[PDB]
């Protein structure tokens, strides 16, 4: 795909199903890690991890 954030989506899709067995650190207390891979569209909201 011509999507720039497609690897971010590729990371998040495994991340959404590994919610609750293996955890990753966040940046603030407003985004639970279990948000979906759909909303990651912008160059921002890419996680530090």
């Amino acid at each position: 795909t011509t999507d720039p954030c497609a690897p971010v989506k590729a990371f998040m899709t495994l991340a959404n199903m590994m919610v609750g067995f293996e955890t990753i650190p966040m940046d603030n207390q407003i985004y639970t890690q279990s948000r979906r891979a759909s909303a990651f569209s912008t160059p921002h909201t890419w996680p530090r991890c």
């Binding site: 795909t1 011509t2 999507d3 720039p4 954030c5 690897p7 569209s41 912008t42 160059p43 890419w46």
Partner: protein, 49 residues
């Protein structure tokens, strides 16, 4: 295109009908109103695979 490259990602694609030197009302043409880089297009992943 970029591989895994954060600030090198393009965001907005804009076009101007105005010279650079003199200010006016900001034109800010129609292509910029897309959330991503342009008009989106959904593709079925099944046929791709």
């Amino acid at each position: 295109y970029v591989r895994l490259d954060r600030d090198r990602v393009p965001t907005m694609v804009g076009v101007t009908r105005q010279s650079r030197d003199t200010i006016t009302q900001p034109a800010l043409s129609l292509s910029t109103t897309n959330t991503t880089v342009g008009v989106p297009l959904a593709l079925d992943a099944r046929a791709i695979t």
